[PDB]
Design a protein around this ligand. Structure first.
Ligand SMILES: [K+]
Ligand SMILES: [Mg+2]
Ligand SMILES: [Mg+2]
Ligand SMILES: [Mg+2]
Ligand SMILES: [Mg+2]
Ligand SMILES: [Mg+2]
Ligand SMILES: [Mg+2]
Ligand SMILES: [Mg+2]
Ligand SMILES: [Mg+2]
Ligand SMILES: [Mg+2]
Lengths: 276, 157, 160
RNA sequence: GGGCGGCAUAUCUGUUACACGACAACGCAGGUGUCCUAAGGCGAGCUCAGUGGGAACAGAUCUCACGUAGAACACAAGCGUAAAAGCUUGCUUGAUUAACGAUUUCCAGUACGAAUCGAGACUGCGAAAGCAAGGCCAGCGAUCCUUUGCGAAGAAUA
RNA sequence: GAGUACGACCACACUUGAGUGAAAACACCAUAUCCCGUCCGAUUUGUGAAGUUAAGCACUCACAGGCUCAGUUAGUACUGAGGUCAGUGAUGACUCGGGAACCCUGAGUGCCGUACUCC
RNA sequence: AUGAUUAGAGGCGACCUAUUCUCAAACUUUAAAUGUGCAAACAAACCGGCCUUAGCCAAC
């Protein structure tokens, strides 16, 4: 009647560490790192996007046997250095993070000033140029375990990188403003989401009352300059991509020795024997 | 009675205890090029491009590489002669062979010794055989004999 | 600690009618009118619908269960509680709950089941980094009975 | 012995079978001449058999917890599989064509059946990397004869 | 001395009970006009920052269960080569070589990369 | 673990909990001895220029 006998643990096989922790999809990882054998291990890169509760992380990663190697990273908590200092999670923040990552990567590789990308965000789909005139840098999108739905911040980061200048293959089936029944993309809604018009409308509605937007209302942020702030942030990111925020006591508990543990057990058994 | 493709493979195409699962990422990232030595070991969890049971455990030479497959040349004795068979398998059923690890180490050591001699460095000392004679100074000496207790402790009842 | 306060997670209303047809449709309409949301039909296990159920949570659920307690006279047996930390009870003649009887649908019974819990139960139901909740953080039968006594009237004791 | 009986007459799984491969008996225990527009292809979301505590009729359904597969994959058996290869659902026709490419099994290194790695066309699903030219592995057929499909209309002073 | 993201090996990393947690993170958390999806904003999606270490997470402990490496079992079981060997036989020992397994008993309870950040 | 199989004990007639006696060509965690594939520098392998490619890679 007890299922967890000794035989259960004798015959139990554990899963991979990251599968137990619940952070890696290994089927997807195998298919993403798979490459044609005739290429003999040519470099291949994935742009990995991870959205936490209060920040979003975008990385350019190449796989390796010893361990993955990170080429360039960008975080949303550096946007205040480039301008906007509120939200840091919405769609506009995602777009800014993607653009910053693309600019940093191109500058690091030295191919910058040859692939300037798109200057002004129009929210329109343009097919990426790939082998399948010098070709752009290419990476494939990695969303992990996030559910892919229309109008998602992972795809916002994707659009940011594409407008920055990287060549990430995609279709406009998941951008904000795509009508499935009509198979068309409306650029107006996409631009509004990229520049945070919905955030401004919500802020105005909340301010027209009598917790939400607490720090927003505490600051003097008026819901009529967010688009200008985001445009200035785009300009600053484009101008100076390599910028960031301005700049061992021990606590570990020592583990007992085996001899000490045995001595403690012997003392305890002597104590109970005496008490008996 | 029956002579099918996978007859008599109940224990051959099976996973070891507590070692089930699909191939890992190290297999996917391994590079194979024409002219390498590989071992053909079937992975029972793939079931695609599996070699025939005869070739399980043989070592050969790669002669062709495709997007997902490898071509290997394997010796097979038939009657009075040896045939060179060409088999096509998926990349998950092969692994790099270490059959020349000792020979490659031998060549590298010779090159290092040659460089040191030309540079006039100090060569390492030569090992001596253990099969030579010498004086033995014993530390503990015991008498070897059969005792009465040896026989009494051989009747478990 | 404020985070350990016990709150009502959800309330499930179930009506197992049997067969399939006019009675099932009428029961579904009655349940929809009572719960102010669309119910869901459940089939057997062998493919015919046999029951209609609905789940309610939030302010609507808190406002509800008051009629159930009033019908039950705010009294329940001890064995109605469960080791998990949830409980429930049956009810007959929903006209007692006061749904303004109409000749189109007759009288129907129902079963209410209320499930309680604390904050932080999400870690056992999220997709990413899914884990298990702590045994101390779990809800005990004694704690559930104490909560029921503190928020409502008393409970009788029995064996079966 | 032959006859009567039975197929050991083409063929699949476990064992006989002696830790590469090969190996007989009218040896043992069992299968095959079918079935499927979905039970094929792909994406996504879920977790099965069972057990325990609870909820009117109710001694069918609802809820929580445990649950390494003890379920399921058309059929015999073996192997394999858990954010799947199982269940549900959405869209589809890679079950098409495929320049006489190469190879495995039987083996005389002949054919047939089955299978593996490919190049070209047009596609399906998917954000994408990718996956798919049936349902992995049994389910099938020479000469002669009969019968069907492609050598569309247009243009060359050849 | 720590944290987060991506990882390789895939229990010395698992399972059950307890205790502790500086900073910054991570996380619980608040909410539903818009993007999106459900019987249910539960899951998922969008928008935030009033609270908390209660839970997840990390570390430590248990004459804990498993797991890993050794010893013993034991030159025992078994086995390649040999005899005009013993024995009615079953079988056995001997000669030149190879050589296990369970129980039982000791020790241990992850390690190694890339990038960014906090003491 | 799967499939057989004798008895007693504790919790509590039944069941669970550890045991206990005996086993499997179509049962197995572990696992020999005899085997079996490859390699052991002369059309090869090793170390630094150059030429070509309509191959790979953002490029070299
Ligand atoms: K056979
Ligand atoms: Mg996926
Ligand atoms: Mg054999
Ligand atoms: Mg799936
Ligand atoms: Mg041919
Ligand atoms: Mg053929
Ligand atoms: Mg093709
Ligand atoms: Mg014919
Ligand atoms: Mg014509
Ligand atoms: Mg122990």
């Amino acid at each position: 009647k007890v299922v967890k006998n000794k035989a259960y643990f004798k015959r139990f096989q554990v899963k991979y560490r990251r599968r137990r922790e619940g952070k890696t999809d290994y089927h997807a990882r195998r298919q993403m790192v798979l490459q044609d054998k005739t290429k003999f291990g040519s470099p291949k890169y994935r742009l990995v996007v991870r959205i936490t509760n209060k920040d979003i992380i975008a990385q350019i990663v190449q796989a390796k046997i010893v361990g993955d190697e990170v080429v360039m990273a960008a975080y949303a908590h550096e946007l205040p250095a480039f301008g906007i200092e509120h939200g840091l999670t919405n769609y506009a923040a995602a777009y800014a993070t993607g653009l910053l990552l693309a600019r940093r990567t191109l500058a690091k590789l030295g191919i910058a000033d040859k692939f300037q990308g798109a200057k002004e965000a129009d929210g329109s789909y343009s097919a990426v140029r790939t082998k399948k005139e010098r070709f752009p840098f290419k990476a494939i999108l990695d969303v992990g375990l996030a559910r892919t739905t229309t109008g998602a911040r992972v795809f916002g980061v994707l659009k940011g990188a594409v407008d920055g200048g990287m060549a990430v293959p995609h279709r406009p089936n998941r951008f904000p403003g795509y009508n499935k029944e009509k198979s068309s993309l409306d650029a107006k809604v996409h631009r509004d989401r990229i520049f945070g018009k919905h955030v401004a409308d919500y802020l105005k509605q909340v301010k027209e009352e009598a917790v939400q937007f607490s720090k927003y209302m505490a600051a003097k942020v008026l819901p009529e300059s967010i688009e200008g702030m985001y445009k200035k942030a785009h300009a600053a990111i484009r101008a100076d991509p390599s910028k960031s925020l301005p700049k061992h006591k021990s606590y570990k508990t020592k583990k007992l020795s085996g001899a000490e543990k045995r001595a403690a057990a012997k003392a305890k058994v002597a104590a109970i024997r005496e008490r008996l | 009675h029956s002579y099918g493709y996978k007859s008599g493979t109940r224990h051959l195409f099976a996973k070891k205890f507590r070692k089930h699962g699909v191939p890992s990422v190290s297999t996917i990232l391994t590079n194979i090029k024409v002219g390498d030595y590989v071992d053909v070991v079937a992975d029972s969890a793939v079931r695609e491009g599996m070699p025939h049971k005869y070739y399980h455990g043989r070592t050969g030479i790669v002669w062709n590489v495709t997007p997902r497959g490898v071509g290997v040349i394997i010796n097979k004795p038939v009657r009075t002669r040896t045939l060179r068979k060409r088999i096509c398998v998926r990349f998950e059923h092969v692994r790099k062979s270490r059959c020349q690890e000792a020979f490659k180490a031998k060549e590298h050591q010779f090159q290092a010794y040659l460089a040191a001699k030309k540079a006039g460095k100090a060569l390492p000392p030569l090992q001596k055989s253990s099969r030579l004679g010498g004086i033995v100074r014993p530390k503990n000496v015991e008498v070897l004999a059969r005792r009465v207790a040896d026989y009494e402790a051989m009747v478990p009842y | 600690n404020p985070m350990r306060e016990i709150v009502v997670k959800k309330l499930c209303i179930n009506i197992c009618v049997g067969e399939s047809g006019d009675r099932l449709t009428r029961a579904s309409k009655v349940l929809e009118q009572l719960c102010e949301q669309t119910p869901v039909l459940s089939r057997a296990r062998r493919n015919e619908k046999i029951a209609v159920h609905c789940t309610v949570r939030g302010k609507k659920a808190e406002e509800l269960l008051e009629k159930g307690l009033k019908v039950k006279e705010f009294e329940l047996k001890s064995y109605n509680f469960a080791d998990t930390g949830s409980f429930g009870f049956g009810i007959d003649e929903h006209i007692d709950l006061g749904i303004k009887y109409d000749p189109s649908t007759g009288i129907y019974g129902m079963d209410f089941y209320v499930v309680l819990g604390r904050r932080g139960e999400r870690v056992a139901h999220r997709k990413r980094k899914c884990s298990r909740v702590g045994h101390s953080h779990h809800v005990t039968k004694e704690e559930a009975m104490k909560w029921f006594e503190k928020v409502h009237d008393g409970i009788i004791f029995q064996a079966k």
